Symmetry: D2
Subunit: 330 residues, 4 copies
């Protein structure tokens, strides 16, 4: 296969993580980006990163192109999909990382201008088909617009895949302890709701997520069986899924941990891993696994009532899945 050619719409945390990941691999090539910023600021943000460290390599411009380690990348700056002829620079797949385009209606214009496939970097706001690697990726039907779901779906999903396949999930509730993100306020200031208005680096902030209820999209046998919620805490990156569930049969802790290690070695290779070293959140910064189960934190009480704790780099793991998904569907 020729390396699939892709464009990135939206050069934020996910956009720039995706770009770095594409530049480390030989089976995918970045030809264009779009962000509503001047080129001096694009270069600076790409080169220097508080979380993932300095990009090793030259980051130059000339004058509508990023030049990264000598390779030219076209840079657009328009809010309007009309002005983004990504296909004209060779793009086969657009990675949609703006947060602005989460319906087929708003992504169809890319296809109409000659892009073959669009992948949303977030849950769809309509009935756009949703795919998650290792969970329902085997069912892909060649659709030209898909959702890759959320960072949380790409941790919780693989965990559920293993539990459902080995044991059976009767019901479950999930909390995520989640790193703060953009569109949380630095100081108490107006936002879309009360709790999101409060200072993110000095509070525990309850925040809603549809990630659990929406598992029906990628595992329909879990329709009506899972819900959950989030607690935003003062870390800049890395999060955990805390899944509490009732399984269809009696299990032990060891049996659960062994099922995860067996998937880590086979069907979820590269996607789920198991931590036997007692790491903390910062150890998973720039980790490409979507789920890291902390084996020592696995609990079972009264035969069938379990807790599983899985880390995810909400930036780097999800970005790693977006890039895997572009390579998979090409």
């Amino acid at each position: 296969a020729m390396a699939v050619k892709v464009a990135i719409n939206g050069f934020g945390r996910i956009g720039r993580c995706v770009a770095r990941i594409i530049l480390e691999r030989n089976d995918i090539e970045l030809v264009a980006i779009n962000d509503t910023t001047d080129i001096e600021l694009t270069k600076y943000l790409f080169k220097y990163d508080t979380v993932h460290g300095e990009f090793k390599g030259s980051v130059d411009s000339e004058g509508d192109d990023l030049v990264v380690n000598g390779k030219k990348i076209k840079v657009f700056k328009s809010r309007n999909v009309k002005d983004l002829d990504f296909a004209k620079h060779g793009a086969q797949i657009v990675l949609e990382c703006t947060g602005a385009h989460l319906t087929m209606a708003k992504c169809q214009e890319f296809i109409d201008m000659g892009v073959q496939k669009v992948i949303m970097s977030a849950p769809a706001k309509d009935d756009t088909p949703t795919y998650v690697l290792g969970v329902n990726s085997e069912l892909y039907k060649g659709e030209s617009i898909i959702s890759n779901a959320s960072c949380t779906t790409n941790c919780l999903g693989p965990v559920c895949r293993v539990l459902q396949d080995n044991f059976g999930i009767e019901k479950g509730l999930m909390t995520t302890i989640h790193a703060y993100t953009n569109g949380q306020s630095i100081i108490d200031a107006k936002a879309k709701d009360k709790r999101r208005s409060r200072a993110a680096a000095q509070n525990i902030i309850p925040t809603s997520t549809g990630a659990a209820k929406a598992m029906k999209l990628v595992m329909p046998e879990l329709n009506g069986k899972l819900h959950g919620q989030s607690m935003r805490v003062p870390v800049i990156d890395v999060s955990s899924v805390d899944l509490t569930a009732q399984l269809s049969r009696k299990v032990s802790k060891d049996e659960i941990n062994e099922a995860f290690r067996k998937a880590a070695a086979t069907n979820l290779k590269g996607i789920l891993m198991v931590d036997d070293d007692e790491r903390v959140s910062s150890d998973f910064i720039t980790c490409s696994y979507g789920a890291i189960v902390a084996s020592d934190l696995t609990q079972v009480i009264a035969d069938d009532f379990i807790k599983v704790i899985a880390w995810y780099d909400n930036e780097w793991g999800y970005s790693s899945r977006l890039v895997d998904m572009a390579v998979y569907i090409a």
Copy 2:
């Protein structure tokens, strides 16, 4: 009743919170403290607090006495209970806030020197009787040495009391998102185990707690039915209990929230309250309630599988219970 006279052994976060709470009430009087610090540093730490703000009032010394708003308080500085004649300064109850004395054997010397009652500010390391206000305080038998359990027991306990009395708990697992505390490291440095060695203000740190399994001490019907664990996050104070449980019957969200509001108004007055305002952690700094249930975060799936989220000021709520317990047993 004459105001019960008490001494505080250990003038740390709990010791100093307890002292401030005693100085705001007329039914308890502080006569002595002990801490292995010089008197200049005792005054400074008591007067200024990063979390709970400046003490309003005069904080002076003369020269073995704190003088707080004109009232003289004896200050000892010895690690050894032998040198602490608290009873000689009128103390009826010792609040044991050192972390050093969590067995009847190590507290008996206080009784032997004329103290009437000792209350441990932590779970006992032996079979010392444990009491929690609103949970099993009605069963107190006049024992002269007791444990008031942990900050977590004084949030989770009252929550369980309500769930058990209205609905029946079949089984449950708990996560606490907990503020960092003393004897967590500022930077990666050796501690009693791996995870406790890691920088507390820049990581999510899984940490063990016996608080759930130990609920059998205060609610024996929950023997073998609860376990749980902790995630230390970068907040200086205030924590949450996240309880996931299977109840003995079908319930709704509204029914659970109404049971909490009914206890808040009756048997758990002053102990449990319900938040209907969508507060965040910093809103509960210096809150005297041991449990604040966030009503909007209450979840039920598949009839009987529930999640309840309750805040607690791990410093001020527990300290408020220690002071209530001293007044109650006097």
Copy 3:
């Protein structure tokens, strides 16, 4: 005097601090506010504050009015000064706390609609007269539009007043270690320049300030003699001025500290104080002094080369000066 009636345009950190300060005093009355938020969010942000704690008292609405402890306050929600008939609700002075209106041209519409006086909550972007209490407030000429300068001017200004009056300033450079503020990013994301794009709670961020060069506006004898700069650090509130200067004559540390204590007791009463207790930043949260000189940090080398360190609550001290200035010019 009747209590001067004021309106607040812009209900952010400064707007809400100003409002709380007005509600604690009997010589000024708040009749109206404006902020582009729904009334539910206005109430929540006013009631709960991560930094300054819960407002003690009832915060209700009915339905275009905040009702605070029973007193009705009109709430507008328009970006356009055209729609803000503050004078119709009795306002004599508008406190301009939006950041949007820092020229006489943009504030004249308030006067044209019957407001007597406007005070900008920031340095003017034109030649609008600037006044700072204790510095050049004695020179006020009855102007109907003024600037109260910046939080930094209201710390550095009073410090310079004392140094200039006792000793003579030949030249000086200033660094401020400054709390993060709104319009700093939570995560690395595009902003008006490179450094402002970087995560505020995980970096030391050099940031420009005109506060030193602009001292000529309030002390013309310092024209061309001072410049300085800022380092934003991860604290939510409270900052320091670090002034390094060459004085016109030889001085000692004691002589400098005594000059500050003498101004604290006389001409800068309520404005500058001296800390002899070795406090840290969080001790000055909700402090109404514009400058708190840390006496133990005062340095002199080689006769005439000095350093002075002064704290300021960048929110509460400046807000306290805005309210003092409204009362002073009424």
Copy 4:
């Protein structure tokens, strides 16, 4: 030259940074360490680092040896220099990183047991000769016990070298904005003085440093001409020197920046660099330069009164100098 063989006494932040730096170079070899920890915790802390990331490579034990990428390193665990036969494992130089041994008297026992040279990882508490690379390293006389001074000396020193050589320093005062370190408290708790007792991740904390006054040890022409102080802020690593000085003649900003760039390219190659990219603190995590002058922050007022801002990774820059110094004196 054979690669000089060294041992590390004290495996904390400096000890472990030094070890990682030694394992990346071919001109120095690590044969032994000492730390009062069990071997499981030594491995974990070496392998995982909140600040500098995961060690790339195998970290094993057998059973009194770290095995790092296949190479055996002896591990002692004794507080007493008596039990540390580093020379028996081939060590020529001991890097003294405990903080416990800062006099010739306390380091002489190493020489007496066959070590050729000891380097203190901190300023000496006696008249032990002090050397700093690029500053007075050319004057080394073969002394077998030296101090490498402090992290701050290894930033401020090189900056002064350039200013003194090009312009002449008449006098100067310095502030450092410094990352928190071990032996600062996580929560308000007793420490050696008042300010060090206060919570390090939620305050700006004034802290004393002898680094400026002590410049006379490495540049005697600066005897009595410099003093300074520190402000600890909530960052886990990386600090800045803010030097304010009066030079012997008139200079411009450009002239100062050009003098630094010229030293960066010649006599201070590898030691001082100049930032022309507007980086923030986290960009210098794991930076080996002892001084990074931020060229855009250089200020001059009234001919001869200057400010210079220089970053340093207080861990990695100093550690890089310790390793350079061991190679230089071998």
